[model samples]
Target: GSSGSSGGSEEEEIPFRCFICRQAFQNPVVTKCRHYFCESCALEHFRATPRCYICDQPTGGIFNPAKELMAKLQKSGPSSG
Candidate 1:
């Protein structure tokens, strides 16, 4: 059975999924602990109570734009086929 490129494989190749939303990152941000989340998701979470989603460490300050991660994500897009 010649199975073509499965969506599973494509999804597995993506490195930074939003921990808060469990989806492909939209304006992803990284916590000090190096955990990733959507920008909006991170904001909402911190607003409730500041903490790292992964290790529950105190969130440092601001969530900067994940430039390299975003670039890699863009490179892994549908157009990459």
Candidate 2:
């Protein structure tokens, strides 16, 4: 029998939970709604198809995750889902 140490099957996946739908993300964007989401959720309101998904406020661009928040999430580990 052979044990595979680098088997891809066990690699950890990051949590993609969207705070709005409370589900996993496909292409996440954070809305002023304080809601995180996949792009499909955001496109609904993006002007030219653009607007804030939560508040309807026009956003300059996708919300970038804060460095502090990123660190916290990372330290909390991928299992925090």
Candidate 3:
């Protein structure tokens, strides 16, 4: 089915997965173009093209570290919560 992304989804959720690799976000980094992906894939995509893959926007070289995501996706241990 073709789902338009113009409107918000049904529930409140965070799309933390990588857009490039289509997997869990590992060492996620934010591009200057605003799109984010895994650090590994980020470099690969950037190396191929100096633009964001999802939006195809210019990535002003170098991606910013996603330290903020660490808090959002901490998978250290299942500390009996």
Q: Please tell me which predicted candidate would have the highest TM-score against the true structure.
A: 3
TM-score of each candidate? 0.64, 0.37, 0.66
lDDT score of residue 44 within candidate 1:
84
The top-ranked prediction according to lDDT is 3
Query: Compared with the true structure, what per-residue lDDT tens digits does model 3 show for residues 1-81?
Result: 987665564663557687677898888886665557888887888788888888878776678986665554566623334
CA error at residue 1 for candidate 1, angstroms: 24
Per-model C-alpha lDDT, please? 0.70, 0.55, 0.73
TM-score for model 3?
0.66
Candidate 1 lowest-lDDT run of ten: 6-15
Q: Give the TM-score of candidate 2.
A: 0.37
lDDT of 1 by residue, 1-81 (tens): 977763544544445566677897888776577667788888888887688676778885567666666766564644333
Task: Compute the lDDT for candidate 1.
Answer: 0.70
The residue-level lDDT of candidate 1 at 6 comes to: 39
Candidate with the larger TM-score of 1 and 2: 1
